[PDB]
Every structure is written in C-alpha cells, then in structure tokens.
Amino acid sequence: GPVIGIDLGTTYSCVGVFKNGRVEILNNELGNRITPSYVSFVDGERKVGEAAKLEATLHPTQTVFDVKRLIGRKFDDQEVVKDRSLLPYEIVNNQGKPNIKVQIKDKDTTFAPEQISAMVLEKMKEIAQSFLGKPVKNAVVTVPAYFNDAQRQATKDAGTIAGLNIVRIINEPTAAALAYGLDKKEETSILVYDLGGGTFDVSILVIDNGVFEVYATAGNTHLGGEDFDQRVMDYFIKMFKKKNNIDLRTDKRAIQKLRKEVEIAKRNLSVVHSTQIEIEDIVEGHNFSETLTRAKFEELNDDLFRETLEPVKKVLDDAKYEKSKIDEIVLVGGSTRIPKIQQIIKEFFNGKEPNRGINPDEAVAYGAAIQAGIILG
Numbered sequence: 298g299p300v301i302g303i304d305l306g307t308t309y310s311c312v313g314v315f316k317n318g319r320v321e322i323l324n325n326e327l328g329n330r331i332t333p334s335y336v337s338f339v340d341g342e343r344k345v346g347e348a349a350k351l352e353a354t355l356h357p358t359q360t361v362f363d364v365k366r367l368i369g370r371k372f373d374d375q376e377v378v379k380d381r382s383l384l385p386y387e388i389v390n391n392q393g394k395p396n397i398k399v400q401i402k403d404k405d406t407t408f409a410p411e412q413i414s415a416m417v418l419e420k421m422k423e424i425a426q427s428f429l430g431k432p433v434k435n436a437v438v439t440v441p442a443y444f445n446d447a448q449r450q451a452t453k454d455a456g457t458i459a460g461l462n463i464v465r466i467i468n469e470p471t472a473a474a475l476a477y478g479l480d481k482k483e484e485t486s487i488l489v490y491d492l493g494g495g496t497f498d499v500s501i502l503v504i505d506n507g508v509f510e511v512y513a514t515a516g517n518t519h520l521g522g523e524d525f526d527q528r529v530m531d532y533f534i535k536m537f538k539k540k541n542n543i544d545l546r547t548d549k550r551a552i553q554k555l556r557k558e559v560e561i562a563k564r565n566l567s568v569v570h571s572t573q574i575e576i577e578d579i580v581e582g583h584n585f586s587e588t589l590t591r592a593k594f595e596e597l598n599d600d601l602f603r604e605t606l607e608p609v610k611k612v613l614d615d616a617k618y619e620k621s622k623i624d625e626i627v628l629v630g631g632s633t634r635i636p637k638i639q640q641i642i643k644e645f646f647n648g649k650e651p652n653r654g655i656n657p658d659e660a661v662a663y664g665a666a667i668q669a670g671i672i673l674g
C-alpha cells in the first residue's frame with residue numbers, strides 16, 4: 298500500500314507523498330500546502346482546517362486548536378495549567394488527563410486530544426487518497442524530539458482513530474535532515490533551529506554513519522510567528538485609538554480583519570522594506586490605512602527575536618559543545634524567513650551562515666515523506 302508523510306504541527310499540518318521518485322507536498326481543497334490544525338463544533342457542523350479557524354472569532358469556545366500542547370500530558374502538569382489559562386475552549390480533568398469539552402447541537406461532548414488530532418490526520422489522509430486515487434492506510438508522522446513515550450503513543454492512537462497505521466514516528470529534527478539531504482556518512486553535528494507559528498524548538502542532531510541522534514533539545518513553547526503579529530497588532534491598535542478615538546479591540550470582526558492584513562504585511566517585509574496595511578470599513582465609516590517598515594517590524598519584536606538565543610545557549614551547554622563544534626545550522630519554520638532572525642543566528646555563531654530552504658514550512662513534511670520512501674525501499 299502507499300505510505301504518506303505527515304507533519305502534525307502545533308498550528309498547522311502538512312502532508313507529502315513520495316511518488317515516481319519525488320516528494321509531492323499536496324494542496325488541500327483551498328489550494329494551500331499548510332492546513333491550520335483547527336477543528337470547530339458550531340451549529341451542528343464539524344469543520345477542519347481553514348474553515349474551522351475562521352469560526353474562532355465569533356465562536357471561540359467551540360473552536361479547538363493547539364491540541365498538540367495537551368496530547369499525552371496530565372491535567373496537573375505545569376505546562377497544561379498554563380495552556381488552560383491561555384486557551385478559550387474548556388479543558389476538563391478526565392482521570393488525571395486533559396480532555397476538550399464543546400457543544401454539538403447544545404449537548405456537552407468531551408474529546409481526548411488524540412480524538413481531535415485524529416480529525417486533522419483524517420483530513421490529511423483524504424487529501425492523499427484523492428491525489429493518489431486509492432485508499433491510504435499507512436503514514437510516517439513527525440513529533441518533537443522532546444516528546445516522551447506517552448506523547449508518542451497518544452500520537453500513534455490519533456493515527457489508529459483516523460484509520461492510519463503509523464509505521465514510524467520520527468522526530469522533527471531527523472525529518473528536516475532527510476528533507477535537506479544532509480550527508481549521512483561520517484559524523485556531522487547539526488543545530489536545527491525550528492521557529493513556527495506558535496512554538497520555538499532548537500536541537501543538536503548528530504548524524505553518524507546514517508544513525509540520527511538528538512543529543513540535546515530546548516525551546517520556548519509560547520514564541521513564534523503569531524507573537525510577532527500580536528506585537529504589530531498592539532502597535533496599530535494604539536495608533537488607531539490615538540488618531541480616531543476608536544479602540545479596535547471593542548470589535549472582534551475588526552481585530553480578525555486587521556490580524557489577516559498584519560500577517561500578510563509581516564510576510565511581505567521578509568522581502569521588501571515597506572508595505573501598506575489597508576482595510577476598507579475596518580468599522581463602518583472608518584478605513585484602516587498604515588505603512589509598516591521592516592525597521593519598525595524589527596523594533597517591535599527585537600526582544601522576542603533575541604530570546605530565541607537563550608534555548609540555543611542551553612542546548613550547547615547541555616551537550617558540552619563549543620559554538621565551533623556545530624558543522625551546520627538548519628532553519629525550519631516559516632518564521633526563519635525573517636531576515637533579522639537569520640542575522641541574529643549568523644552573529645551568535647561568530648559569522649557562520651545558516652542553511653535555509655526556499656519552503657521551510659514544508660521541510661518537516663517533506664522529510665516524513667522521504668522516510669516513507671526509505672521504508673518502502
């Protein structure tokens with residue numbers, strides 16, 4: 298049978314197939330290579346992906362996301378106590394474990410995290426089946442290198458619920474190394490710098506005659522692209538209030554429209570120096586129209602960019618490594634396209650240039666699909 302590769306991310310998932318000797322990263326039905334890991338339970342319908350994410354503005358308690366933060370953990374774990382205070386959907390204690398509670402046609406309905414992750418895996422499965430024109434029963438699925446056995450097993454259980462035999466779990470650093478075709482002969486020490494939408498992970502990965510070992514891992518579970526957007530949002534909400542006597546936080550729809558344009562402006566500023574953020578009638582009778590520069594984008598986020606270096610010093614200290622011991626730096630996550638991030642990493646490594654791809658958001662799924670091909674022979 299076919300074996301597909303799935304990057305099951307905190308904020309998004311991505312599915313790849315290995316076919317006639319190539320990895321193809323598959324578009325969802327809206328033509329995107331990345332699917333938001335959102336599931337909504339509104340008005341008797343269940344939605345998965347972008348349509349679910351759009352429900353979050355008006356139905357925040359019914360729109361489930363960031364389930365990867367809960368999967369295989371205990372309700373009283375210090376990380377889960379913190380996530381319950383941040384997440385707007387209800388999390389309950391079922392026998393020591395966090396479960397998600399929502400309403401379906403007004404009825405209280407409880408889900409284990411693996412049941413929500415299974416709904417994301419089933420959408421990625423369907424994208425594969427439709428593209429390949431046959432049923433898919435097998436998958437390689439990625440996890441963070443810091444996942445323990447209970448987190449890996451709950452990920453395998455999500456696959457079983459979705460009708461997927463997960464024939465192999467591989468860590469995100471390993472998947473990145475396969476995607477970039479890092480040479481497997483002799484011994485190489487790789488720093489994998491992974492800055493996504495919601496989380497930051499860094500690992501030291503050593504490749505030794507085709508054996509992959511993560512020697513050390515550290516990160517920041519609340520530092521990613523979304524934090525950079527929120528800093529811009531905070532600035533423009535202050536400015537619009539100063540100029541127009543309108544506080545855009547009082548209108549949830551206005552906030553949703555601004556967040557969309559701010560995300561687009563951030564992306565543009567990875568290439569250009571100046572971009573316009575425009576919304577006709579952000580509220581009735583009032584247009585939003587501002588310029589954001591790369592310099593103001595950086596000024597608003599420079600403390601958060603520099604915080605990424607704290608886990609980097611920690612993994613070097615944990616592995617008793619000198620900076621010069623790192624043979625290469627590999628960047629994964631869309632947020633590594635930010636020019637200031639690359640510059641700060643280069644400077645920390647006394648001038649050594651980091652390796653990036655052109656699609657860092659797809660590297661992990663790409664490597665999962667490579668592992669699928671390696672397993673089929």
Ligand SMILES: N#Cc1cn([C@@H]2O[C@H](CO)[C@@H](O)[C@H]2O)c2ncnc(N)c12
Nearest residue numbers: 493494522523563564567631632634635
């Ligand atoms: N294409 C693209 C980019 C994606 N991301 C971010 O990666 C995160 C995960 O997808 C998310 O928070 C997103 O906004 C980018 N960030 C900066 N510059 C870019 N050019 C991109």
